[PDB]
């Protein structure tokens, strides 16, 4: 059974991170992707930015194509809109927090 989720969160350096299945992941500024196998949920937040919303893309597709070898069926969603499939895996949406500032040019990023 597949399921991973991913945290896709950045600005001018975007990564996509391995999280737990889990609401608690969540946040309303970044993006996340929920693998369930042949059906990938890409979802953002309402204060992700351009960025992470085309790297969310990049990913859900890559993992599509590549790992799937394009068999699977990336879904967009967002706060509010989540498929009936994200709810079974995650359980009802609780209130989200705010997500952190993208940047950190000092730090290894
Ligand atoms: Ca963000």
């Not at 945290?7 to 946040?27: C, D, L």
């Not at 994200?86 to 940047?103: C, F, I, N, S, Y």
């Amino acid at each position: 059974v597949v399921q991973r989720l991913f945290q896709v969160k950045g600005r001018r350096v975007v990564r996509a991170t391995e999280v737990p299945v889990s609401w608690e992941s969540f946040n309303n500024g970044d993006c996340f992707i929920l693998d369930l196998g042949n059906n990938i949920h890409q979802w953002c937040g309402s204060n992700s930015n351009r960025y992470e919303r085309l790297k969310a893309t990049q990913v859900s597709k890559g993992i599509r194509d590549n790992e799937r070898s394009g068999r699977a069926r990336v879904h967009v969603s967002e706060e509010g809109t989540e498929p009936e499939a994200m709810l079974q895996v995650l359980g009802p949406k609780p209130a989200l927090p705010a997500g952190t500032e993208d940047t950190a040019k000092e730090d290894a990023a």
